[PDB]
Amino acid sequence: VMAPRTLIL
Amino acid sequence: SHSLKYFHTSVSRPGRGEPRFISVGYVDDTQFVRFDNDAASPRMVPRAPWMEQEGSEYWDRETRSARDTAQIFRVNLRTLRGYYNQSEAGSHTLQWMHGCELGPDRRFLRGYEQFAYDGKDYLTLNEDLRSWTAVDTAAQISEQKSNDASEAEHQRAYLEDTCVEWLHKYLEKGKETLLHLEPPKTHVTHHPISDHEATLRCWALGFYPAEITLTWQQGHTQDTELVETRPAGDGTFQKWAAVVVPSGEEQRYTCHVQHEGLPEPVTLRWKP
Amino acid sequence: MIQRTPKIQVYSRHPAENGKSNFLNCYVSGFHPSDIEVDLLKNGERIEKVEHSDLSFSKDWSFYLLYYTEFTPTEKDEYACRVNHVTLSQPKIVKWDRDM
Amino acid sequence: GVTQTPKHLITATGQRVTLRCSPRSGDLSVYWYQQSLDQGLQFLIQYYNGEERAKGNILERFSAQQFPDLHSELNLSSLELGDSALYFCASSANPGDSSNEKLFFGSGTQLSVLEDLNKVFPPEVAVFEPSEAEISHTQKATLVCLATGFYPDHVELSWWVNGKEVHSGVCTDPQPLKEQPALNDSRYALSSRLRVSATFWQNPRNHFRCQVQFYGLSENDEWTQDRAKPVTQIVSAEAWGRA
Amino acid sequence: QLNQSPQSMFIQEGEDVSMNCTSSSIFNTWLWYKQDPGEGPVLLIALYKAGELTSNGRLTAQFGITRKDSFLNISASIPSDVGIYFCAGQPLGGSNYKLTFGKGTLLTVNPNIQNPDPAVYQLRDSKSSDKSVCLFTDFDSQTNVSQSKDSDVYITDKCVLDMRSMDFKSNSAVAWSNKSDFACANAFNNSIIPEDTFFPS
């Protein structure tokens, strides 16, 4: 599964 | 060792509308899933036959996950302009890659997570997986924003737990495909040049995984022509190494093949 | 800005035999940005049947794609793939060799 | 920064309503919450930069959307008696800000869903003069104001002295009390007291007024009843100085 | 899903109050809000790191090494703190901009009563009729007064007033009806009050 969260740059 | 990797890509499109988001999943050297926003059907779809039968909870989760990432990446793109002083005229790239690697024992070995602007290292998750390191002077604002909001903790849980947990699941899902090793079909073909020069090629065809070794001996180091490991198109791989042979004296040169599919390393010569 | 030129490989899935059905691959790698124009040609003329992989990148951030078409080779018909990129001054054309 | 439209809203069962949000400048996300009377705030829908991000158990009869500018609207159809709540708007997601996840709220929309609009009533405000036994035993003043015979909770009681506002000694009742507790849709009630010095109100030149701002029926609402229209009205009760 | 105990806290002014927030999952960010009746929730403290304790004067919040608990302490409790305290959080592994809230903890701050001298007075109407009010002022802190026992007679809860100019505080309660079987006294009966209370004419 792909990461559930990401970075808000 | 096995690894669950993901390659996410967002590209800004001036005048063409909303930016294009594309993410691809890889269990080892096998692409198993994909996502694309360019289609009217914007869902996570199976790209391996073992994923074809999985159920709609999984496909619902991964779509909402990818959907959300695409929303953020779109904003991240307009934001990344402010940093590098850009305009609405140029099409720019935002790439995100993540993945966990298992050990020779069966449990977590290492993990990684990198972001990049216009195909250049932007922000990287530290080896320890506790904080973020800026690889560019413009990433400094994005870094001392993430580090303060404890963002690395979310990525640490996925990389150490989720990624690993699911990787075992997928490896089991397709044991008959992923864990099965296809050894390379090897043959030496001759293509002459002139009275002196001649070319001898070592063909390694139909092997999985792509990690292979092919070298010519007399240890012949001086000017060896080697091609990049190319996908065969069927799921296996192809590779070859060529050598300049002085006409007549062929047996003086030997080719060595090294792959996990072979019990013992195989050596080969041309059959005339 | 990162401007990387594409590495082009034109080959077949299995050993080429005249009158035997096969697949023609034009594998494009090491390029940046994403935008790439790849066509497959039979005797200079384009192939419309041609299909392609999913856009993906290496650890060095450079993209890689495969362009495949179901094809039956002969000794008289000659094939090659036409690749055009932003780094390319001339739309590069590379002949297919059954022995390369 | 968050601004909501309208403030107080009152309609009948079966109708539809629209509620506006003007989020903080730069904040891309918008959230909609339904804080009932004591039943804690429950999430409804969240939009992010125009598109729907997350949903949270919406009844299907509840619609919403975010525009090209980050403004939003919450649509409520077949308004049912149970939906009577304080709807709040939230704002976040400014990639300019460093505190990002931090949410910001606007002063909610007070929505009430009645069956019969003829059950809406204005407030009864009457001013009361101090007791002679108090201004000696305690040696101080107290002017008591009461609010009765009104519906619904929409009321704002205040006090004014010599033409301007006053808050010292003021004791406005916080919760409304049903005049008829053994009745449904009961006319609520409140209370307040303004304590001043013994000499301040003994001066005839001083003014002591109680005020009740009530939020009533809309202009575009039909009133088939014979009586007056129970609309939004400032109802007051003034009292002058006495020695 | 978050849970805040004890749901309600009936406290005395000047005292200190503790508030707990427990979750059924590991969290990464904790948010403490206060909501006044009618007003929108306003942010007090925000916690990002596991061990840190952060403050805003009289208010202090803790993260808790457990990652499933958070605390909120109020040093000096002026009756201004009367409000609902909502605990929010960022569940670990949740997508961007996803945060849960609790039902909140209601804090009640009782006034610091000095002189418990009670009295019932006759506040006369601005109309020459019978509709009048009986004001009960300056009573004790220990009391637990109830609402209108009978139908025509009405009684309200306690309220705190302050004479900021002459820096003196007190308490109050109002009683009103319509009948002749009415004129203060026999008004407050169900509620218990001590033997010494001033009753004028």
Q: Which CATH number belongs to the domain containing residue B5 in this structure?
A: 3.30.500.10
Same domain assignment for residues D176 and D229: yes
Q: Of B138, B164, B180, which residue is a domain's last?
A: B180
Dist CA C34 CA C64 (whole Å): 9
CB-based burial label for D29 (10 Å; 0-12, 13-18, 19+) = buried
Q: Do B31 and C56 touch (CB under 8 A)?
A: yes
> Do B142 and B221 lie in a common domain?
no
Range of the domain at D120: 116-243
Q: Phi then psi for B78, rounded to 5 degrees?
A: -65, -30
Pairing, β C37-42 against β C45-46 = antiparallel
- Experimentally, how was this structure solved? X-ray
Number of domains in chain D: 2
If we measure between CA atoms, which residue out of B128, B171, B129 comes closest to residue B3?
Answer: B171
**Residue D176 DSSP SS3:** coil
Among D59, D86, D115, give the residue marking a domain's end.
D115
Q: Across the A/E interface, how many CB contacts are shorter than 8 Å?
A: 9
Cβ atoms of E145 and E171 closer than 8 Å? no
One domain for residues B164 and B188: no
* Shared domain check, D145 and D93: no
| Alpha-carbon span D131 to B213, nearest angstrom | 105
Domain final residue pick, B180, B205, B226: B180
- Do D193 and D152 belong together in one domain? yes
Residues in B lying within 8 Å of E, measured between beta carbons: 64-65, 68, 72, 148-150, 153-154, 157-158, 162
Residue of E nearest to B158 (CA): E93
DSSP E127: S
> If you write DSSP's letter for every residue of B19-62 in order, what string do you get?
-EEEEEEEETTEEEEEEESSSSS-S-EE-STTTSSS-HHHHHHH
CB pair distance less than 8 Å for E96 and A4: no
Q: Same domain for B160 and B218?
A: no
- One domain, residues D9 and D51: yes
How many helices (H) and strands (E) would you count in chain C? 0, 9
Judgement on whether residues B144 and B195 belong to the same structural domain of the protein? no
Residue D156, beta-bridge partner list: D213
Cβ–Cβ under 8 Å, residues B163 and B4: yes
DSSP character at residue D104: E
Does residue B161 sit in the same domain as residue B226?
no
Among D98, D115, D132, identify where a domain stops.
Answer: D115
Cβ-count burial B225-246 (b if 16+ within 10 Å, e if not): eebebbbbbeebbbbbbbbbbe
How many angstroms separate the CA atoms of E51 and E58, rounded?
20
What angle (nearest 5°) sits at the alpha carbon of residue E4, between those of residues E2 and E7?
Answer: 140
Q: Under 8 Å CB-to-CB from D224, ≥6 apart: which residues?
A: none
Q: For tokens 């205040």, what's the residue?
A: D158
Q: In this complex, which of E119, E126, E148 lies closest to D126 when CB atoms are compared?
A: E126
Residues E9 and E90 in one domain: yes
Q: Are residues B104 and B206 in the same domain?
A: no
Q: Which helix (H) or strand (E) holds B68?
A: helix B56-84
d(CA C36, CA C53): 13
Q: Are residues B160 and B200 in the same domain?
A: no
Amino acid of residue D175: Q
Residue E56 and residue E33 share a domain: yes
Evaluate whether chains B and E are touching (3 or more beta carbon pairs less than 8 Å apart).
Answer: yes
How far apart CA D45 and CA D40 sit, in angstroms, is: 16
Quickly list DSSP for B139-203.
Answer: THHHHHHHTTTTTHHHHHHIIIIIHHHHHHHHHHHTIIIIIS-BPPEEEEEEEE-SSS-EEEEEE
Cα torsion at D83, D89, D90, D95 (round to 10°)?
A: 140
- Across the strands, what pairs with C82? C39, C93
Which amino acid type is present at position E133?
V
Taking the alpha carbons of B141, B147, B153, B155 in that order, is the dihedral positive or negative?
positive
Q: E192 with E164, same domain? A: yes
Contacts of D147 (CB under 8 A, 6+ apart): D123, D124, D125, D155, D157, D189, D190, D191, D192, D212
Number of neighbouring beta carbons within 10 Å of residue D58? 15
Would you say E146 and E104 are in contact if contact means Cβ atoms under 8 Å apart?
Answer: no
Continuous segment of H or E residues that includes residue D125: strand D124-127
Tell me the C-alpha distance between D175 and D179, whole Å: 13
What CATH number corresponds to the domain at position E40?
Answer: 2.60.40.10
Last residue of a domain, one of D73, D93, D115: D115
Whether residues D95 and D120 fall in one domain:
no
Helix (H) or strand (E) holding B267: strand B266-268
Terminal Cα-to-Cα distance of chain B (whole angstroms) = 40
CA angle A7, B1, B3 (to 5 degrees): 25
Same domain, B206 and B118: no
Alpha-carbon dihedral sign for residues D171, D174, D180, D185: positive
Place of tokens 């939230």: D90
Contact partners for chain D, using 3 or more CB pairs closer than 8 A, are A, B, E
Beta-strand pair D8-12/D109-114 = parallel
CB < 8 Å to E96, chain A: 5-6, 8
Q: Which residues fall within 8 angstroms of residue D203, CB to CB, at 6 or more apart?
A: D241, D243
Are residues B230 and C4, on separate chains, in Cβ contact within 8 Å? no
**Domains in chain C, CATH or no CATH each:** 1-100 (2.60.40.10)
- B210 and B130, same structural domain? no
Rounded Cα distance, E124 and B204, in Å = 108
* Residue bearing tokens 């050894």: B183
End residue of a domain, out of E111, E132, E159: E111
Q: Are residues E36 and E103 in the same domain?
A: yes
Nearest chain D residue to E36, by CA: D107
Report the residue from B24, B191, B201 with minimal CB separation from C56. Answer: B24
Torsion angle, CA of B12/B14/B19/B20, rounded to 10 degrees? -80
Tokens of C54: 């999913």
Quote the CA–CA distance of E198 and D138 in Å, as a whole number: 11
Encoded amino acid at B34, one letter: R
Residue-wise burial string across D142-171, b where 16 or more C-beta atoms lie within 10 A, e elsewhere: bbbbbbbebbbbbbebbbbbeeeeeeebbb
The DSSP code for E198 is: B
D227: phi then psi, degrees, rounded to nearest 5: -70, -175
Tell me the structure's resolution in angstroms, rounded to a single decimal.
3.3
Residue where a domain stops, chosen among E64, E94, E111: E111
Nearest to C55 among B9, B205, B232 (CB): B9
**Does residue D120 share a domain with residue D238?**
yes
Q: Are residues B103 and B211 in the same domain?
A: no
Burial B98-137 (b: 16+ CB within 10 A, else e): bbbbbeeeeebeebbbbbbbbbebbbbbeeebeebebebe
Domain identity same for E47 and E144: no
Upper half-sphere CA count for residue D106 (Cβ side, 13 Å): 26
Domain range for E28 = 1-111
Q: Show which of B122, B146, B180 is a domain's final residue.
A: B180
* Cα separation, D190 vs D214, whole angstroms: 13
Total domains in chain E come to 2
Q: Which domain holds residue B133?
A: 1-180
- Please check whether residues B9 and B129 belong to one and the same domain: yes
Domain count within chain B: 2
Domain shared by D130 and D62, yes or no = no
In whole angstroms, what is the distance from residue D102 CA to residue E131 CA? Answer: 52
CA B144, distance to chain mean position in Å, is: 29
Pair D188, D237 in one domain: yes
